[PDB]
């Protein structure tokens, strides 16, 4: 998955998330066209497959011909009451996309972190099943502590949690950030 955010000079905006699903999708590359084919069928639930201990299949997300599989993607644009764009945001990272996107929004809109900090700030994730709370390596360990004393079992993400690209309107114009977890940088004028 990749997310990107765009604001044009006229104040119009695009938030776009695109994916071939797993790394290198299906692993089928066309030797003629070069096209690397998605494995998006893996985003469906199957009554025969068990992904996680004690997690049942979700029949609302079974395969049907012509059906689109459930996605965690959520490319978002926040617009102020005056009709001006306030934030263009989204993420890559499977089921972590939705929590990471919520975090980037919380961080900027409520905690007051500028867009770069909102992107770079440590993240955590819980999706109910499995039961665990995953935290990034450099999280404020006072957070880890407050979670564990409240009976969350935490574990540390061996790599990182999601990838966020974001743009926020500021007094100085449009502040943009790309996630260092993946190595992007923004560009503008």
């Amino acid at each position: 998955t990749a997310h990107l955010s765009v604001v044009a000079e006229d104040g119009s905006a695009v938030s776009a998330t695109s994916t071939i699903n797993l790394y290198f999708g299906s692993k089928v590359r066309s030797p003629v066209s070069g096209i690397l084919f998605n494995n998006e069928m893996d985003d469906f639930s199957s009554p025969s497959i068990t992904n996680e201990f004690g997690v049942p299949p979700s029949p609302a997300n079974f395969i049907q011909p012509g059906k689109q599989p459930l996605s965690s993607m959520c490319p978002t644009i926040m617009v102020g009451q005056d009709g001006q764009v306030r934030m263009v945001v989204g993420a890559a990272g499977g089921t972590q996309i939705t929590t990471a996107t919520a975090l980037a929004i919380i961080y900027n809109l409520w905690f007051g972190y500028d867009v770069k900090r909102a992107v770079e700030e440590p993240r955590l994730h819980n999706q109910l099943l499995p039961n665990v709370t995953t935290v990034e390596r450099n999280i404020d360990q006072a957070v880890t502590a407050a979670l564990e004393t409240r009976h969350h079992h935490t574990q540390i993400a061996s790599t990182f949690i999601a990838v966020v690209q974001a743009i926020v309107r500021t007094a100085g114009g449009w502040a943009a950030a790309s996630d260092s977890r993946k190595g992007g940088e923004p560009a503008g004028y």
Binding site: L36, P47, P69, A102, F111, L128, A145, H152
Partner: protein, 342 residues
């Protein structure tokens, strides 16, 4: 530099693609033109992540009309697919049978027909050059190459482009995509039709089926990107947030934020360790409640999600969940009432 810009900005996960997006804006393109040019570039520099073999959604806001729209171009199950077609994760993850019908190019075409200002071929030009000339492998891709070293090195057709001396490329090393360059050129010149009903179509079908898949020319002929005039939104203070509904996770995001808004987080929420810890605990609890309801979502054309989504975007519903968040403890899974049927 600092990455505040007075006129326009593109944030992509590869610098060169952000630049390509920016140049498009500079040359007079719409926000859509820039997104497409950048997306085409990301399909190369982060080829593990996305590209013309996949699908996408675009959330688009027009500051003149002040309207938001969504373009749904996510892949669909092929006409020959069925509920029990897979028996192991491996079958649903690897090979032609795992491939859904790619929506990407139709999606770019629909977005471009509605909002494009540059010519179609101009959006491809910079990426055609990039793929022919090659580029240093960036951080993201190099880690992905590493993560998937075994499968890549064992599969001649991937190793063909993703290896150097039969070992995965590493950061800094040059990646060249000569076949994709040719394909991008065809797309630039013949248009979207070449993929779905034109000069690429038969080859696409042959590649997928040779790999054990079941995609057919009809599947490609029939794919349609879809315009969604009324995307999901929620009201947050004095702002509105536009995001896609099912089959994407707008409803989930909406429920998370609506649960959390009743706490009125501010800078004070993270000032002390006592406040910070409670704040994060509360966030994790909102996650759990939101994901409990997620298991009811699916393609709204195939499953009725009207009321499920109504609940998930309802502030009253959110307030009911917020009321069951205990400040001193998390709870067992059943507490959050995950559901697999309505």
């Amino acid at each position: 530099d600092n990455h505040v810009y007075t006129r326009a900005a593109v944030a992509a996960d590869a610098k060169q693609c952000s630049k390509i997006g920016r140049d498009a804006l500079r040359d007079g393109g719409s926000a859509v033109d820039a997104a497409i040019a950048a997306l085409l570039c990301v399909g190369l520099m982060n080829a593990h992540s996305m590209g013309i073999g996949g699908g996408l959604f675009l959330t688009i806001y027009n500051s003149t009309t002040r309207k938001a729209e969504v373009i749904n171009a996510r892949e669909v199950a092929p006409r020959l697919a069925f509920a029990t077609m897979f028996n192991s994760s491996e079958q649903s993850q690897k090979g032609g049978l795992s491939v859904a019908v790619p929506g990407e190019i139709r999606g770019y075409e629909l977005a471009h027909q509605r909002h494009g200002r540059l010519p179609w071929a101009r959006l491809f030009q910079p990426s055609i050059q990039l793929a022919r000339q090659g580029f240093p492998v960036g951080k993201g891709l190099a880690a992905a190459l590493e993560n998937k070293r075994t499968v890549i090195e064992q599969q001649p057709v991937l190793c063909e482009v993703f290896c150097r001396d039969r070992k995965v490329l590493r950061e800094g090393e040059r990646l060249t995509l000569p076949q994709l360059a040719d394909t991008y050129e065809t797309l630039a010149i013949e248009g979207a039709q070449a993929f779905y009903n034109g000069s690429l179509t038969a080859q696409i079908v042959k590649d997928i089926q040779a790999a054990g898949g079941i995609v057919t020319a009809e599947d490609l002929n029939n794919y349609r990107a879809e315009l969604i005039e009324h995307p999901l939104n929620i009201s947050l203070g004095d702002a509105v947030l536009y995001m896609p509904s099912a089959p994407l996770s707008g409803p989930v995001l909406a429920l998370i934020l609506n649960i959390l808004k009743g706490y009125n987080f501010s800078r004070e929420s993270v000032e002390s360790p006592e406040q910070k810890g409670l704040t994060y605990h509360r966030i994790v609890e909102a996650f759990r409640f939101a994901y409990a309801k997620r298991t009811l979502l699916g393609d709204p054309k195939f499953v009725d999600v009207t009321e499920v989504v109504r609940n998930m975007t309802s502030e009253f519903f959110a307030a009911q969940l917020r009321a069951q968040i205990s400040d001193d403890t998390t709870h067992p899974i059943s507490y959050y009432k995950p559901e697999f049927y309505t």
